[PDB]
RNA sequence: UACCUGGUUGAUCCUGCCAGUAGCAUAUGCUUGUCUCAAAGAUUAAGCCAUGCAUGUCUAAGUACGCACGGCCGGUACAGUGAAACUGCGAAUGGCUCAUUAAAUCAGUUAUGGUUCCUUUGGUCGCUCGUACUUGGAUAACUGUGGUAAUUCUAGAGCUAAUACAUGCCGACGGGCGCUGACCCCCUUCGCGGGGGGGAUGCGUGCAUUUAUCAGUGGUGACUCUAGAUAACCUCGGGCCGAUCGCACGCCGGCGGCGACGACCCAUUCGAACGUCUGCCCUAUCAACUUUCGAUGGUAGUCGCCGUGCCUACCAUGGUGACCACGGGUGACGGGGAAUCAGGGUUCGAUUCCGGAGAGGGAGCCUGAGAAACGGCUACCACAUCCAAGGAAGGCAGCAGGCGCGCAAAUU
RNA sequence: UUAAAGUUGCUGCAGUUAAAAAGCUCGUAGUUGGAUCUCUCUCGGCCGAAGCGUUUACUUUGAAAAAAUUAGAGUGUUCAAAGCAGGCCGCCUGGAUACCGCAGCUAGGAAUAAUGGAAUAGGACCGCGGUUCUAUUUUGUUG
RNA sequence: UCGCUACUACCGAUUGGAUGGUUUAGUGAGGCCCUCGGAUCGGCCCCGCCGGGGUGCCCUGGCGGAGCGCUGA
């Protein structure tokens, strides 16, 4: 199964897949209610996490983490490792000596959801905070903008 | 530190108490208790700074191991207890109630109260929840636990509670047109009528104000204290009726004064 | 001693921190409980606050729940089989959560049979108790009969689970910490679970 | 007060530095009448320490059979004051110093919807359908016999208590609510049958624990939230459901009013701990660094108070860098701040306030709400103390004080 | 060690001969870059609650920013450095206020500076039709 | 250039010495956890001397002995 590529079996914990119901119910369609909830903070949920197959736990709109702190913008810069991707922000800091500025940039690692594809490196994504996923992971994507070069 | 902190520095302590710097190194560390450590007037400098019923701390022991001072109806005998906003203090040896309210300067005002008034006080709505067996809680500023309150009773609402029993008699819902105080930030101790609330969500509320004389400022949320329905504020009021005058006004007001005596 | 800190790593970078304060006390770690099958041993550990945990050593028992059915019972686990952490951690016969084991079914066994009023497990030997038939062929009266009689419709189970109620013994997922909170509950497989967890046992071989 | 002057030439005009000029911090020299405030072993040696002190504690209210006391009354179990000792609490605060430490510490700003919390304040404390008008065994202080050169070392024997250590009920208790359910009644059909009721008999039940399923009181910007329902579970190294104490004395043998001490849980106060965004000196005669030995990420788990490569197994090959990564140096604890000052700027901040770190150097622990504690313990390394040579005991970067080091700093 | 030092020069220095422009050109990062364009749909009793206008940089405002220190108000320490006291014949009265880069939060302005909005038209706005999933109002209730 | 005086920096055979910091391999104190172990200390049993009550039997009290008894620390 393309959904079960790992050891264990993954599954949405709150939901439960084992209902004996009836006969005609297997007869008729095999296909799981899916879990999702509203990522709240004027954002809208994708409709490819609520029509989508994904087992994933640090996604925000169908897994277990919960959006709140910081929101901010980035450029997509690397797509390489797995379900995750690192973005720059550049910003401009006031040396007040010179009456001046410089460029200085950040790059930081932040989770990409299944429920955000068909993205490039060039487009402006805007992050959540969130708690620890991992050593050098704290946001997690919650909205995807096409870069200049838009089809 | 490998624990928690009993001491309290001079310089350290909340401006407003008015402690003066050559008087000791230490400050009275208010104990734990209903109202914080920086928004709190421990007993000690109530009794002895401000009344000087007491020229030392020890005498203030004395006079509260006597029994005498009673805080919302019961004798309390720690002399750093933490007393706050609202609360009633009562001497019966010498017949006084006073209520802890903040002056326009920002600072607790010696302000005397008669016996009926310090019969009950204004409490605001921290925190409401439903315990065990559906039974709604509330929990107050004053870190009162209330069962059973009017379902109608919501967050940052003002009720009114009996000392004696410390039940809910009345309440003053949170809307534009009511009267408040403001019990923090740089409005401290300034009354006048909400107008607006503007909704920041995932951050902190904003509320405007605007005074008698048509003066106007804004606070965060968890600024404001809801005295009265209206206009009409539901306990007494400081000198200052909560207005705050420019430091050139005050300065007439005052020049005119040592004219006036001869 | 054991620690969990997390200067003792590497920057993000790459680079070579230098700790700037010594081990503390809000930062140990301890060492595992590989809970084994066996007569029960628990061991209680004072921790943080000064609350307990109940450190399992050895499990025999434990309660496990038929979720189609609704049914949760004690039960004595008896074998440890595929492990999706470590496949170490089966030939040591060591339970942690998320594992597979094997149950009994016979208190499953007898809630099938005295609801349903259907033999289940019984091989085709015609084995018949007095007892037995005493729980399935009692009379009951007209309300009854007919209150058991419209449950029958719905009284089917898979073929999957069937064929283990045949070998007495069932196979379950541990759905708790039993070095953390000293018991094994749990739930048994069924439907597309069961399915992929009999692919990689039969994969193992 | 937005300032200059001397010096290269036989003489001139420049470039340019040297010297002069004023404050400010350390040391030092000579001099010194009155009075107010006032820094003071940081610099170098976070080098070493003789001696004394710096942490203890009882109310009416845990335990009094010391005549240790003047004194009641004499059958009064205990009149009172009260050493000792058991029990509880504190000793994790304060004080000192600045060695380490270069996105580390720290500052402004945020989050815990990802954790714990002694105590204070408020709620809760007949919600559970199953000897009590009082339960058991000890052991201190005390008496007596001792051992060792030696310590705040302790052995044996004879007593005796508990809010120490254990055990364990009555009562509200009559029931109610869920399943199982032989038997009984009514309506209809000619009947079989169908429909609606009553029910004896049994199994469970409250709050905290653990697992699974179901429906949609209150609230959030957003819950896998709170509240609810169902099937079970519930650790002997064990979970709550009061065998405790004082003061006034009473109403009709029963009922009782004020407190004190304890109690799982919830909230609150004091916090603490992890994370979010921005910000630091010199150095390229440091340009590539990390990944065998976790480096970036995924899946499942272990451990942890919890979120996390925190750790393990299996996978993938990632992650940072001239916008200066990685490495090195710092007479580098970081801020609030101090000196100078036309405006811009330069330099300092060991130092009484806030945060961090340490107790000769490493490491590991016990107790406890809280410590990897050092005026706690256990080892090793370096020093060092008494000795009958068998052994025992150590930690002034606490207040004085001494030695040493120095240009450099006060009273046992 | 600061000023003097416009002898480290952002304000604000020099490079023909006094110290000094690479032998010359290409070229990535960095720095800099020519004209040009004049607020509204639903609701609660004529206003508010809710959407943004492409996004910013900039400017003004607001709240949030430990005390001590500094600036500064009052006050004859006998004057002053200080202090937070004090004054009237039991009363009266203070213990103000300003400043607090950068970053983060908030609301007005729209000059200057970046940025996007239709050119295989997969363009805007209007009415029209079809395919699929689907709202659970209506059949006093229940299927 | 050659001759005379003083002081600095550098090269240098001696695989220089002193001081301190990193690591390969091996050994490895002490605490903590797990599996064993069992010096001792009770209780419930069994007999022997025996009082009371209820009715040869049981509840009891002072015990002594001994049994590869069981159970606890």
Same mark, same amino acid.
Request: glycine share 8%.
């Given at each position: 199964? $393309? ?52 087992? $994933? ?35 401009? =800091? ?10 200085? =940039?950040?790059?930081?690692?932040? =989770? ?5 594809? $068909?993205?490039?490196?060039? $487009? ?28 | ?123 605001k709505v921290r925190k409401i929840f439903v315990g065990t067996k559906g039974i709604p809680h509330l929990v107050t500023h004053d870190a009162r ?118 | ?155 089917? !189970? ?42 990689? !046992?039969?994969?193992?071989?």
């Open positions: 199964a $393309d959904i079960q590529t790992e050891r264990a079996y993954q599954k949405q914990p709150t939901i439960f897949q084992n209902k004996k119901r009836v006969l005609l119910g297997e007869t008729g369609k095999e296909k799981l209610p899916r879990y999702y909830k509203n990522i709240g903070l004027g954002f809208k949920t994708p409709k490819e996490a609520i029509e989508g197959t994904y087992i $994933d736990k640090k996604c925000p709109f169908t897994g277990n983490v919960s959006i709140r702190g910081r929101i901010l913008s980035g450029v997509v810069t690397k797509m390489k490792m797995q379900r995750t991707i690192v973005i720059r922000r550049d910003y401009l =800091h006031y040396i007040r000596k010179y009456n001046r500025f410089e460029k200085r =940039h950040k790059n930081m690692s932040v =989770h990409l959801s299944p429920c955000f594809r $068909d993205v490039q490196i060039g $487009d402006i994504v805007t992050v959540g905070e969130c708690r620890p996923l991992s050593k050098t992971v704290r946001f997690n994507v919650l909205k995807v903008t096409k870069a200049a070069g838009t089809k | 530190a490998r624990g928690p902190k009993k001491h309290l520095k001079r310089v350290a302590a909340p401006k407003h108490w008015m402690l003066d710097k050559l008087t000791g190194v230490f400050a009275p560390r208010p104990s734990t208790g209903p109202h914080k450590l920086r928004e709190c007037l421990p007993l000690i400098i109530f009794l002895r700074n401000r009344l000087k019923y007491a020229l030392t701390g020890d005498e203030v022991k004395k006079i509260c191991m006597q029994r005498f001072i009673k805080i919302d109806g019961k004798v309390r005998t720690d002399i750093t207890y933490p007393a706050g906003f609202m609360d009633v203090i009562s001497i019966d040896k010498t017949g006084e109630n006073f209520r802890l309210i903040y002056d326009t300067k920002g600072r607790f005002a010696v302000h005397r109260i008669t016996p009926e008034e310090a019969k009950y006080k204004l409490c636990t209330i069962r059973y309150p009017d379902p109608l009773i919501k967050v940052n609402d003002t009720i009114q509670i009996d000392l004696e029993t410390g039940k809910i008699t009345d309440f003053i819902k949170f809307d534009t047109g009511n009267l408040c105080m403001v019990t923090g930030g740089a409005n401290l101790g300034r009354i006048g009528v909400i107008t607006n609330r503007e909704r920041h969500p995932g951050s902190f509320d904003v509320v405007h104000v605007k005074d008698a004389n048509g003066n106007s400022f804004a606070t965060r949320l968890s600024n404001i204290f809801v005295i009265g329905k209206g206009n009409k504020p539901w306990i007494s009021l400081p000198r200052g009726k909560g207005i705050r005058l420019t430091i050139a006004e005050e300065r007439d007001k005052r020049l005119a004064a040592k004219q006036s005596s001869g | 001693g054991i620690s969990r800190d997390n200067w003792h790593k590497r920057r993000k970078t790459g680079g070579k921190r230098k700790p700037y304060h010594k081990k503390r006390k809000y930062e140990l770690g301890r060492p595992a409980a590989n809970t084994k099958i066996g007569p029960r041993r628990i061991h209680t550990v004072r921790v943080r606050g000064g609350n307990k945990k109940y450190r399992a050593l050895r499990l025999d028992v434990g309660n496990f729940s038929w979720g189609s059915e609704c049914c949760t019972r004690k039960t004595r686990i008896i074998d440890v089989v595929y492990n999706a952490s470590n496949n170490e951690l089966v030939r040591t016969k060591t339970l942690v959560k998320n594992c597979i084991v094997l149950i009994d079914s016979t208190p499953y066994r007898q809630w099938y049979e005295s609801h349903y009023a259907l033999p289940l497990g019984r091989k085709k030997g015609a084995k018949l108790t007095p007892e037995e038939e005493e729980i399935l062929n009692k009379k009951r009266s007209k309300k009854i009969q007919k209150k058991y009689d419209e449950r029958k419709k719905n009284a089917k !189970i898979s073929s999957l689970l069937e064929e283990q109620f045949q070998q007495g013994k069932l196979l379950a997922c541990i759905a708790s910490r039993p070095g953390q909170c000293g018991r094994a509950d749990g739930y048994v497989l069924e439907g597309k679970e069961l399915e992929f967890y009999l692919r990689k !046992i039969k994969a193992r071989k």
